[model samples]
Structures are given as C-alpha cells and as structure tokens.
Target: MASLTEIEHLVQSVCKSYRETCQLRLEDLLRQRSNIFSREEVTGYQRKSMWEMWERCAHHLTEAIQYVVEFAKRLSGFMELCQNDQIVLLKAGAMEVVLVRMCRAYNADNRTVFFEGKYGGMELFRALGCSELISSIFDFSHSLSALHFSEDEIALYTALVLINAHRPGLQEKRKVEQLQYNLELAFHHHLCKTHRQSILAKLPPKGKLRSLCSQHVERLQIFQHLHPIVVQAAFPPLYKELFSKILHRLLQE
Candidate 1:
C-alpha cells in the first residue's frame, strides 16, 4: 500500500544516510593530516593533547556522546540540515536513543547500571545530575523487562519515536492511549508463538519517547548554557572553532 514517493524516499534515505558519517570521518582525517604546526601549544589546548584529555574527561559519563553523533548521522536527511540545526537535534535526540540501548544493559530491581557488561552500583550514579530521569527509565524498564517483545517490535517503537514530527501536546498522550486501546486486544503476551509478527503489527510505545527526548534536551541545554564558560576556561583549539562560534551566536539570542 506504500506509494512511489515512499519507495523513492527509502532509496534516497538508505543511499545518502552514510554521507554525514563520511563527512565527519573526513573532517577528523583532515584535522589529523594538517596538524603539522606546533605553534603556541599547551596541554589540552592542542588537538593531540585535548583528545587524550577528552578520553579521560569525566571518563564513562559521556560514553554516549560520540556514539550519538554516529547514530544521528545515519538518520534520514539529518546530514542535510544546516550545521547548527544538525548540532541542535544531535545534541538531544541521539542521546535519548542511548537510554533505549541502556535498557538492555541495566537492571532496575538490583539498581545496577552496566556499561559493556561492567556492573556499577546505582549509588555511584546518584551523584550524576540526571538521577530523576534515570530513575523514571529504570522504573519503566523494570516493568517492561518481564514483558515479551521481539527485536522487530522494539525496533518499530523506536522508529515511531523518531518519526514523530508533530507538536508537543496533550494529543500525543491521547494518541498513545488510543493506540493502546486499539491494540490491547490484538496482543497475546502469553501466547506460545515464536514470531512476534502478529502483536507487533499494532504495538503501542505509550509516552516514554517524550520523556526520553525532554530529559536529553535538558542535559544538552545545560551544556549549551555552560559551553562558553567550559571552553573559555579550558579552551581547546579544535573546539574553539565551533563552540566559540556557537557561543557567540547563542549569546546574542
């Protein structure tokens, strides 16, 4: 039932999705290629040293940021957006998706967070600023983990979250609830079937997408607000080009 435009869109989206990642790859390569100058350098100011610092800075706290950039670059026409617009969306949406991935890695009943299968006590994470958001997610994941859903089912929900280009309103909540009512009878959670194809056809992801998006947006906004101060104080030459320019633009706003 899909239209020609839909098919064409898929073709273009799949083909061009790699473009932005390629662009980022080329930029990094170019920077390394041209780093022949050692003029007026200090530790953490030069790209070579700043990279070492970036690796250790806050350690695993930002484990998601670099991955987020790659994830976003693959989204349909995301690379087509203007650079600032690209940064704005990447700064939020992609980070939210990382939490989705975390559902597979963390356990809520025991209150442990896992990165690469290394278990860390939730108490250690409490010092981080996003504790409330983390708690909400763990609560939901704790509830959802026992429920049976397949890869295709979760993948469908993730896509729904991403394609939601509508306004933030009561209607979206209603849509999730409406979808649940419409779909509830269709699902057979206790069924012994191997394939999830039947229930996933009408699955409901409810309201968590907004929660994920909003939480990530707050974190990024805090970074944006402090970006000028962070860079000016530490001031990386590689970062100075973009963050400084962005700081100037944001200040006037």
Candidate 2:
C-alpha cells in the first residue's frame, strides 16, 4: 500500500491530468463546432446555437472543481486525523478517500465524456452513482442494518438512470417489481426485527398501537418477514418517510 503522502500526490497528479486533457478536448471540439458555425453563417441563415449546452458544460466543470477541492481537503484532514491516532476516523474516512480516487480515475478516462457534455457534468452524475454504490458497500461493512435497504435503493436508482439513458420506453415492469420486492424485504426486516422495541419505547400507548397496526397490517402484508424492528424509533422521521415514499412509488408503478 502507498503511504498517505504518496496517495495524495497521486490524486493531485491524476486530477491535473484529467483537467488538462478534458480542457484540451473540450476546446478542440468547441473550436471545430465554432468554425462550422462560422462557415454556415457566411453561406446561409444564422443557426441558433445551444448556449445552454455551453453553460451546462461550464456548470459541470465548476462542480468538478468544487468536488475535487473538497475531496482533497477531506483527504488531508483524514491523514492528519490518522497521524493523531484517530483510528475510527482513519478507517471511516478511508472510504471517502477511495471515493475521491475513483472519481479521479473516472475523470482520467476520457471515454466517460460520452456520458456528459461540456465540462463533465455527465461524468459527475456517473461518479455520484458510483459513489452511492461505494457507500452501500461501506455501510454493509460497518454492520449497519440499513445496508441492504440502501443497496436496493442504490441499485434501483442506477438501473432507472441507465434504462432511461439507453433504453427509454422499454417497459420492464416485472424486473422493476422484483427489485422493489427485494428492497421491501430489507425494509421489513429492519423495521420488525431490529427496530421494533426501540420504536415502541418512543410512542404512547395509542401511538404504539398505531405503530404495531402499521407494521403488522400494512408493512407485514407488503414485505418479507426476516428481521425485527429493534432500532426503528431511534431513526429520524425523514428516513421513514423517504423509505415509505420510495416503496410506495415502486409498488404503485
């Protein structure tokens, strides 16, 4: 394994290369397009060019700068923390460091440009997708009970984007349903086996009854019973709401 200093240097070198290459390619493509436009303008009616496309490219480049800068800052912080004997930070922050490295690698691969337009916005979008996948794996490694749920959500989101991008209008309802079903199983398992008592403790008697009814009637009917609800009440409402909304939307479709 490389030392932290070596890794940091590698990241910087990779990012610089990506920036230089992307800039050269973008300028070349734009100059070619501009020349074509000029020729057309001289011979025929002026065609309205896509200014928004250029703006989008610029916006993506700005975002990439922000992401790379932040990633570098975080990596430096992680290294410092590790040096100071912060073991948990070293371990936990490793994933973030790897994620940044992955982004750097993806950026280095110019073929990814086919996905995004001007400044690599499309590339950033794909990077985020990859980040989510990494996050799912990290969560699982940490023994987080929500890992499976997150994995399902990430997988579905990835599939949704990929299908929309490449095979739009191909109605694969059954496949979508199967994915949802897997997610539901994870959700139910988390709510029932892992989070039940914790949720019950938070509620008044009536609220507890309502919670039980919701879990037993609605949730149980919908999902596979594998895990218990030990930590449900410990989580914020936003998590529940988001999970419910995603599951409902999938089932409805």
Candidate 3:
C-alpha cells in the first residue's frame, strides 16, 4: 500500500504538471501582439459561424486531451497496468477528467470559460448553435468551481476518475479495484484532514459524469448530422478518434 506521504507527492506532481501543461503561460501572452481577452463578443452571424468556432475548439480540445494523457502517464500505479487496461481506462475517463480540469480556468463570477485564448461568456458560443452542450459545460464548471477544490484535491479526484473500477472491459478488474481503493482512501484522508466536509454531497451522483459525457456526444452527433462536411474537414484526427469511436459504433443505423 502506498503511504499518505507518497500519495502527497503524487498529487503534487500531478498538480504541478497539470498547471504547466493545461493552463496558459506568461510567455504565451508575451508572444502575442494583441490582447485576446479584449474582444469578449463577436457580433453578427456571418462573422461567427458554428464551423469556425467548432474548428477552433477542436484544436484546443485535442491539445487538452494530449495533456490529459500526459497527466495519466505520471499517475501512481498507472503504468504498472497492462497496455490494454491503460487504453480502456483512458478511453473511458479522459473526457471526464478534462471536464473536471476546466474548473481551473472557469470564471464563475462572469460565467465564462477560458478557451480559444480568450475568456468567453456562454453567449460567445451562440455560433455553435448548440445551447445544450455549451450550457452543460458551463453549468458543470460553475458547480465544480463552487466547491473550491484545491489543486491537490483536483488531482486526486482526477486519478480516482481515471482508475474507476467499474469501467467495462478491464481484464484485471480486481487489480484495478485494488488501486482504486488506495486512491479512495487517500482522497478520504485528504478531505478529512482539510475539512472539506460534505463535499461529495455537493458533487453529482454516481453515473452523472457518464450522463454528461453521453449528452455531449449526442449533441456532437446532431452537430455532425447537420454539418458532416465541416466535421470531416475541420475536426482534428485525434478528436474524431477519441470521441467518434463509440458514437459511430453505437449511434449509426
């Protein structure tokens, strides 16, 4: 069993790397000639198209996925699992982790999420024409941000999501559960130690994350149905591969 001391280091490592890879750096702002945050809104339908926004988001989403994968790689006991098990775990929970990480950049006061190199209000996403998905993301971020979970807690929660024992197709379900138990205990310890009482009560119930992820994919299907050409032309290959696999397998007639 890993000691709490060891778990502390693990969470710190994850927290540090997450901030480094996932958030914007000072150098990024310095390299840019103009302030991206100045333009909060884009008026008119012609200037703001669903495809353009989707394409830009897809680019950043792909980068987020890559950094998420890197985070998982550094997780304790993650690499010890077989390659097949690793793939299954990552496939099942990467998006959930990504959604959780979004709280870091979320500006709850103004109801904006930082993406596409700017702080964008929910209205900024009117172009996607998909109110459900964008609003859902904002809602989740809002609620999660309210928790005031620190970097360590976020990292631990992310690990707990990634090491879910219930994820299907695990060749070593017992082994996975063993790892999950250790993480759960560590998280429980941290919560008590930090006085973050009743926190889990505020979080969504079991299967809620799955529901949110499914809702997202369903919305993506509608978007694709309406604009297959844009999807084919604009989406990054990895985004398609990660999100499309189950959609094509289950949703296609």
Candidate 4:
C-alpha cells in the first residue's frame, strides 16, 4: 500500500509533468503559426503577423488549461490517498474548479470565443456546473462550523466568472438550466444573502464584454475569407472524436 506521503509526491510529480507538457505544447503550437497563417492572411486581417494575433488570445487560454489540468491531476491523487474527510472534500472542490476551467479553455480554443458570444456562454456555465457539483460534495463531507474549500478552487472560479458570465442556451437549453439550478442551490446553501450578492457583484454585466476574444475572432474571420481554401483544408478529422465525446458528455449533463 502506498503511504499518504508517497501519494502526495506522485501528485506533485504529475503536476510538474503536466506543466512541462503544456509549455512544450504551447511552444510547438506557436511555431506552427507561419504554416497556419501566411502573409496574405496577415494583410487581410490587418494584423502585422499571424503569430502576433494568435499569441495575444491563446496565451491566457493556454495558461488556464495548463493550470487546470495540473491541479486536477493533483486533486485526483490527493482524494485517493487522504483519509481526512474534510481534506478530501476540500480537494474535490479544488478539482471541480480546475475541471471547470479546463472546459472553459477547451471551449475558447475550439470556438474562438470566450463566454459571451454565440453558443451562449457555454464555457462559463459548464465550469459553474462542475463547481456546484463539487460544492454539494463538500457540504456532505463534514459537520464542522468552518468548511474549507481550497483557494485554488476559488481562484479559478473567480477568474472564469470575471472573464465570462453564464449566458443561457450556449449549450443545450436543458443542460444549462439544470446547471443553473444546481449552482443556485449550492450558493443558497452555503452563502448568506449578502455574500451571494457580493459574489454576483464580481461578474461583469451581460453584454458588457464581447462574446469572442477579439484577437482570435479577428484572425479567424480573416483566415476564413482570405484563405478559404486553406481554411477548408485545415479541417482535420484528428480531434473529431474527442470533440464528439465532450459534446456527448455535455448533453448528458
């Protein structure tokens, strides 16, 4: 049997490995820009270079996904080894935050939109959906006066919510509704009325932020128009299955 300390070490190792992989993947992706976008494409987009445009938008998405995946792997391992119910619950909350952020990054990359655009804020909704589920699990873990959820969890959640708001019908209407209900319940259960209002204050007003990340939206539009052939040709069946799996999971939720 693995000791708790050994398991903790394994979690740390996984987080480090994930961070390294993310850095390398980002570098490789950045290097592919010249091949992905050409001079004509840049001129049409009114951008100095394809690389510049991509870097602006993708930087945050890349970092968010890296953090989420690393933390999530660590939380999974922690949950497996930690016998303290409170600690497990806290870790679960942390895991939910990361999972939600991962979903947000995935949405941003695949759609070139953050949270406010078409597909009605699917990323934010999905992230909160996971958060609500984790909060529920946290509530069930202990009877103590002070419940502890990890700061990492709050950090990711606050970041995501600040960047995007829950726009309905981004995914399936039913799915979004279900998630909304769950999140509302979770908030009500744990937060006093004033606290809930304070949390809500942190989010941007609807329609205040653009639906798409400006840089990406601009680049994609230019790419589609200037190099229609290339755009069509760029569609690879490689990640189709993965996308399908995610969509299926979302719909089921």
The CA lDDT at 137 in model 3 is 83
**What digit string (tens of lDDT, one per residue) describes model 1 on residues 178-253?**
3333222222321223455555434336466566557645653554464545535653432333222442342232
**Global CA lDDT of candidate 3, please?**
0.74
Per-model C-alpha RMSD: 12.3, 23.4, 5.5, 16.0
* Model 3 per-residue lDDT tens digits across residues 72-131: 776667778877688788888888888887787777766766655666677777887778
lDDT top scorer? 3
Cα shift from native, residue 246, model 4 (Å): 7.9
Tens-digit lDDT track of model 4 for 153-188: 233232233212143213243433443343333333
Off by over 4 Å in 4: 1-48, 51-175, 188-197, 213-219, 229-253
Q: Could you estimate the TM-score for every candidate?
A: 0.46, 0.18, 0.84, 0.31
Candidate rank order under TM-score:
3, 1, 4, 2
Q: How many angstroms is residue 211 displaced in model 3 relative to the true structure, after the best TM-score fit?
A: 2.0
C-alpha lDDT of all candidate models, in order? 0.42, 0.30, 0.74, 0.32
Clashes of 3: 0
Candidate 2 residue lDDT tens string, 1-253: 3444543454344334334322233334434321222333322221222232223333443343333333323322222322222222222222222222222122222222222323232323322223333333332223222232222222222222111211223244344344334433433343454454343233223232223324323432232122224214332232333222222222222
Candidate 3 weakest ten by summed lDDT: 244-253
- For all candidates, what are the clash counts? 0, 17, 0, 3
Candidate 4 residue 4 Cα shift, in angstroms, is 31
Q: Which stretch of 10 consecutive residues in model 1 shows the poorest summed lDDT?
A: 183-192
